[PDB]
Subunit: 335 residues, 4 copies
């Protein structure tokens, strides 16, 4: 009855998931798998530009890390079918490389002396349930092999959109995310894999429009909103920290006080509520998947018709990470 | 038949207006008035962080500047009633200090051996017509004393909103501007005049929500949209360059091609049209008041109802400056 | 040790934060002219130093911080604050009253010691904790905790002098931008043509004083050091380079070993190849970086380069608190 | 002078731009493996260097630039490009083939001279225009235009040597971040632990080579200079500080006057207190800043600090074009 976790892909998400797990009661990481030099991985675990110094000590040892006194095995196997997760008692694997984001690619972690459950850090395609914790994790019964923890933006959008739907009914809506730059943008103008003419531009020196998927795909999490939402992003020069705006039409007339009260009533460990006039640096490292900001709510009535704007913050890094760890722990406990 | 211009307030807007005027055929600045040390003003005219080096040479002389060989008188009088604009043949004054943004304060430039017309770089209050050039400058007949060149955001919003209105009819709409930080924000966290808890934060290190006025005040420029638009801003870490999004409902059903075609048909020297996937640095220093970006248009149809998103870029500095100079030249020529 | 803070700016607020985690020290009174609601918001939320560790509420006459009440007043003259009503022994003068005129805090029901957060002038001792705090005997009224740059430079320069003897040296600080720079190009009080420029969009040369004033802290180095700064677009976090000539021939290994031997709570030592974000919020006044040492030997002559990191905010703040606590106890 | 560009990266694109404004020079062929539509977009729109001055259209087999056709190919081996079909005399090799193996461009219907945009190795002369371009006689096949940092350092270091004699010196470049740094923390090819860090959110120490390699351009300074860099968050624009000892006693005024006397099209002189954004797009290879000079005299010994700005992009590009034109004419 301790959740032993394996991480495949020790990038930003995998490293932050490891950090977050150190502060969660019933979870621990007993194996890391990644092709990168362990000295590079240990250094990036110790020092994070936006998320601060590691809370403790990390040493490179033969075959892995010593982290806060405890040994963690680190391997460098290319294929999930060759990873002996069971040797370290791993029950559930966080698949966060980005290369196995499907059910038939990610299920390879489950084999003889492998793992028993898999959570992918991506939408994941067909036959893979998409879980935003505390919004729709009740769709898990335990029989699943591979599930998805959705995207970082989905984990921000979903509880806000669900509260609008549950209380007032959504007709349609357009999302605008004002988003930190990410690793798929160039640091200086140049060709990038995929050939997107905007991600080719210096991400820390520009406002960069970019496409999104969370709004169009919201139906995977909230079925009654399937096809009702669309959106786009503006990437801007902060290294993490983002904000999701939704402009929508509803089935009921509302006021600002009732919209804000509905969000406060929906608050929990995943969906926070604030009336403080915060800015993006204030949500770096938070453990909410989504933090509704009541100061930004607009209910615009013009000749009897209403447009409603609701806004939620998220650390696109740690907010998503905290939600992944909740889903990892819950999925592992329901077997 | 040369427009002799006086500038009161040699801040960013006044300096850029001077720069822009050097490249406009029938206009010239013969007097500058500002309380700042002329050596500071000359240095800031020569070197601009976002708008580049001055196109030519500037020298501090006794009583003013020598700019590209020609002498420009620079004085330091506190009150408009004490400025002898007529001594330098000044017909029209750009009032850009921010302290005389009303008709009874700005009309003091008009006195014996003063100026004859005034353009304020601000909304300006009652009894002051608000002019966005090439959107509503036909409301000027010549009898006016003091007029307003509107705000920088109004000059971006107005032609886009007018084209939606003229072609399709607007029911209502919500504006989001993703905006460069400005001089009313702190460089590092601290108390600021006015006590706004968000402008108190480090403007180049945060996404900062902020209130706007352009959408609510659009009726001063487009009367048939009075009260139909509202909005807000997200200030982000670029030093200039901004983008205005409008999400609206219309009186007619539309498609993306028809919205984009309507914008292209409305293009002129003030309102540009582009289908290139540009980013914010690409519009630094442009002379359009507004540059519609067809790549960002969304027409979302859900169960017969449409939400329409249209997006226009603007250099909140030089875009606004170029519009001010157009209005200055036109106002002066119609006497 | 009950502390009073005059001037709840960045330094004052961070000193309040740092004191919450140091035993035997607490702040019982804050004096500042700003609206307490603005002061409370900025204490709760800090762009570079993170959210406040705990709760802050505005109450009548002050704040409730983590359950404890803190008095907040807006008296404009130090002679008017009754520091003793709240048991305040020592005042952190951080408004920016840097004369021995900081002694107005010290009167009947006022404080009994004062620490200025700046160079303090002629008859004010300048203390960099764990470098020269032995010059305090306890009889002083007003002392100075030096500048943030001095607290970084001093232990590094002292270790060079104690081990090898410094002939002369030039400092280059690659420094975060600060509140004396404009956010966008424009006139600024004082009229410096370079601080008038957008501080987060430029490399901005700026003058310094820490190297020229080092004699106040290390007498043997008086008039031996000079330097300047390059302000660059990070909101906090800085690094001090010193190129020096010495009286002995040295090697990189020997210099690095001397630095490691001098390490303590104020002067840290690292061999990790870190960057500026990694020192945000540290409690060292100075963190020597052995990876950047250069000992260049040409025709028997040597130029020696030593480099130390500091959070120009929290490194300096931690040093102030150390000096506050120590001064109050003697 | 008809120029061929192999490698249409930042340096290649800016060289194309700069050539549009220099008479007697034009680019008639570009070779690069990237999609021409991506290359055309990046030529049109540049984050730091502004919009392209004119029009660019993708046509079959190349671009139409300001009415003139420019051939664009994607041949992966220099031996395969028929440079002479487009009248190309000299090739700017900017892909990053830095051996005398750049001579594969030179064959029957290929080019007849090559300039590498990097240090070129053993048997390749290294030219900084207006510092040592007299070492070219015309018989060379493959030459090097040195590095961007070298083109800044060289005229400043040469003027010190010619006027006063340099004993030794240490360089500190406060440098814009570059494309070899990560935008966010992560593994990078090569495994440098510091270039793995977010380049626009950090002060990042990094190694240099220009000072150690200065002998290739100024023989008298071989083995006399060393240095390092601090990468900081501006997208372009850099500044080079040199702390040196000299063979003569000097003063600030004398040093500044020597720098002014050495000024030309490559090496500029200013007394204006500028900042980094003010040198974006300049055509000087190096802009000496007299406001930052220090001459520190202690017990008869002197440390001399001289500082020069450069746009690590356009300063270097302008120098390459000068060397391209001059090499082609002799
Ligand atoms: Mg932090
Ligand atoms: Mg420019």
């Amino acid at each position: 009855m301790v959740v032993k976790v394996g991480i495949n892909g020790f990038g930003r998400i995998g490293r932050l998931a490891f950090r977050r797990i150190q502060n969660v009661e019933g979870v621990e990481v007993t194996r890391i798998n990644d092709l990168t030099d362990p000295n590079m991985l240990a250094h990036l675990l110790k020092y994070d530009t936006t998320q601060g110094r590691f809370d403790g000590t990390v040493e490179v040892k033969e075959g892995g890390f010593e982290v806060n006194g405890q040994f963690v095995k680190v391997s460098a196997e290319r294929e999930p079918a060759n990873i002996d997760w069971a040797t370290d008692g791993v029950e559930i694997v966080l698949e966060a490389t980005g290369f196995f984001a499907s059910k038939e690619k990610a299920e390879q972690h489950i084999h003889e002396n492998g793992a028993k459950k898999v959570v992918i850090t991506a939408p994941g395609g067909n036959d893979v349930k998409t879980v935003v914790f505390n919004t729709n994790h009740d769709i898990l019964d335990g029989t699943e092999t591979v599930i998805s923890g959705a995207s970082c933006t989905t984990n921000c959008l979903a509880p806000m959109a669900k509260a609008l739907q549950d209380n007032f009914g959504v007709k349609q809506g357009l999302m605008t995310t004002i988003h930190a730059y990410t690793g798929d943008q160039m640091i200086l103008d140049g060709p990038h894999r995929g050939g997107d003419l905007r991600r080719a531009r210096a991400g820390a020196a520009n406002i960069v429009p970019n496409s999104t998927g969370a709004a169009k795909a919201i139906g995977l999490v909230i079925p009654e909103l399937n096809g009702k939402l669309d959106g786009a992003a503006q990437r801007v020069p902060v290294p993490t920290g983002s904000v999701t705006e939704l402009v929508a039409t509803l089935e009921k007339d509302v006021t600002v006080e009732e919209v804000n009260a509905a969000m406060k009533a929906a608050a929990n460990d995943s969906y926070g509520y604030t009336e403080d006039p915060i800015v993006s640096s204030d949500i770096v490292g938070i453990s909410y998947g989504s933090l509704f900001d009541a100061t930004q709510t607009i209910v615009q009535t013009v000749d009897g018709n209403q447009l409603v704007k609701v806004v939620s913050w998220y650390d696109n890094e740690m907010s998503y990470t905290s939600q992944l760890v909740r889903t990892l722990e819950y999925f592992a406990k329901i077997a």
